[PDB]
Amino acid sequence: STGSATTTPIDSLDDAYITPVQIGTPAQTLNLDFDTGSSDLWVFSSETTASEVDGQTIYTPSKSTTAKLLSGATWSISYGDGSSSSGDVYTDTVSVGGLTVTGQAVESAKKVSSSFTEDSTIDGLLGLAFSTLNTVSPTQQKTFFDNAKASLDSPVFTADLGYHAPGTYNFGFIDTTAYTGSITYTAVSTKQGFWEWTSTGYAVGSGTFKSTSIDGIADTGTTLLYLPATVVSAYWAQVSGAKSSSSVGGYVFPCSATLPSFTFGVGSARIVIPGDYIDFGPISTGSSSCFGGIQSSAGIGINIFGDVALKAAFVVFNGATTPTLGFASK
Numbered sequence: 001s002t003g004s005a006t007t008t009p010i011d012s013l014d015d016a017y018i019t020p021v022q023i024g025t026p027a028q029t030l031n032l033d034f035d036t037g038s039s040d041l042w043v044f045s046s047e048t049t050a051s052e053v054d055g056q057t058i059y060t061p062s063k064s065t066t067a068k069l070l071s072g073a074t075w076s077i078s079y080g081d082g083s084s085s086s087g088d089v090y091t092d093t094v095s096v097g098g099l100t101v102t103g104q105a106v107e108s109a110k111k112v113s114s115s116f117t118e119d120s121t122i123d124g125l126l127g128l129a130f131s132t133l134n135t136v137s138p139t140q141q142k143t144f145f146d147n148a149k150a151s152l153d154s155p156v157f158t159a160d161l162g163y164h165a166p167g168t169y170n171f172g173f174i175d176t177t178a179y180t181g182s183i184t185y186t187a188v189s190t191k192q193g194f195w196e197w198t199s200t201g202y203a204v205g206s207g208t209f210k211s212t213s214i215d216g217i218a219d220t221g222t223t224l225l226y227l228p229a230t231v232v233s234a235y236w237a238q239v240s241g242a243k244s245s246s247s248v249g250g251y252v253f254p255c256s257a258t259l260p261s262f263t264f265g266v267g268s269a270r271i272v273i274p275g276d277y278i279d280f281g282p283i284s285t286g287s288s289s290c291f292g293g294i295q296s297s298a299g300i301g302i303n304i305f306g307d308v309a310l311k312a313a314f315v316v317f318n319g320a321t322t323p324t325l326g327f328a329s330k
Contacts, residue, residue: 001148001153002170002172002173003096003099003148003171003172004168004169005019005021005096005168005169006019006167007034007166007167008166009162009164009165010119010121010122011121012281013281014161014223016221016223016307017033017307018031018033018122018123019031019032019033019034019126019169021095021096021126022093022094022096023059023092023093024059024063024066025065025092025093026064028057028059028060028064030044030057031121031122032125032126033124033125033221034125034128034220035126035127035128035129035219036127036129036159036195036218036219036221036317037194037220037222037304038125038133039127039128039132039133039135039193040075040107040127040135041094041104041107041144042085042109043059043107043108043123044056044059044109044116044124045059045060045061045087045109046058046059046060046061047087047108047109048108048110048111048112049111052112052116053117054120055120057123059106059108059124061092066093067091067106068090068092069088069089070089070105070136070141073088073105073136073137073138073141074088074136075087075107075136075137077135080222080300081115082113083113083114085111085116086111087107087108088108088110089105089106089136089141090105090108091106092104092106096169096171097169099171101144104144105134107141109124125221126144127143128145129193130143130190130194130195131143132190132193133194145171145317145319146319148171148172151172152171152173153173154172156171156173156316156317156319157169157170157319158174158175158178158314159310159317160179160314160315160330161310163274163311163312174316179313179330180328180329181328181329182328183314183326184266184268185325186198186324186325186327188318190323192217194219194302195217195317196215196216196217197216197218198216199264199265199266200213200267200268201213201214202262202265204235204261204262204263205238206260209263209265216304216305217303217304217305218310218315218317218325219306220310221306222307223306223308224280224294224304224306225262225305225306225308225309226296226297226302226303227296227303228297228298229296232251235262236292236294239259240254241257242257242292248289250292250295251295251296252289252292254289255288255289255290261274264305264309271313272312272329273312274312277293277308277312280292280293293308313328313329314327314328314329315327316328
């Protein structure tokens with residue numbers, strides 16, 4: 001089997017992407033944030049504290065003839081941005097782009113933190129990291145991809161995120177019309193539960209490529225590109241007036257600037273992020289200070305190849321017995 005679904009930016013900055021997902025019988029369609037940096041499929045629901053729901057579409061398990069309470073199971077998750085959610089668990093039928101999994105754990109939120117409430121466009125998350133990170137207790141549950149894998153034509157999914165435009169998540173096949181050149185594959189460590197890999201270096205604008213190993217994660221659920229402070233300083237030094245602002249929380253730059261591109265290495269191959277992809281607009285409405293899309297990872301503990309990096313590529317998440325990542329230009 002295969003599936004193919006369009007993913008759409010939630011706003012004019014590409015702050016996140018939503019993909020429609022059918023849950024239950026009859027189908028309830030919710031727009032989920034596909035997140036290769038986590039491993040829980042959770043939704044706003046009829047069980048979510050009413051004051052914490054503000055415009056989201058909810059899953060109502062009592063209206064699904066295929067929903068079953070997973071008795072005793074609870075979940076609770078905290079994300080790198082400080083947001084969080086928790087609740088109980090149903091199993092139900094879940095379909096993405098025509099690919100159906102029966103018995104998928106659907107984690108129903110009883111509580112969500114303010115940032116989820118405040119984002120009316122995201123109805124939940126669909127985790128695509130390794131199932132070892134799933135938070136369901138006392139019986140850990142599998143991701144949608146893990147459940148589908150055996151049925152797929154090939155044990156892969158691909159992320160093709162758009163810049164200021166829709167893109168595609170495919171399951172079970174590699175669309176050879178969706179990229180240019182060849183796909184370069186690189187090794188993955190699953191030791192932390194992530195799609196963790198080592199970039200071979202970087203360049204700023206037209207500058208020379210610096211060969212240096214950068215370990216980080218391919219994370220569709222993170223907006224920006226988070227890299228070591230040395231790399232990030234080298235980038236922003238090429239933008240007149242750019243500075244790190246403790247009060248804003250990262251590098252800012254004059255909105256009048258034209259940003260240089262940023263290149264990252266995948267083996268001997270190179271992925272170029274155009275400068276425009278690094279502009280996240282005014283820090284507050286009407287400001288002439290703009291927020292940068294490349295930020296330091298120094299306070300995180302891990303480097304994160306988020307959407308800024310991934311949307312410059314066609315990315316293969318290869319879930320074979322030994323997983324690997326593939327990157328192609330497009």
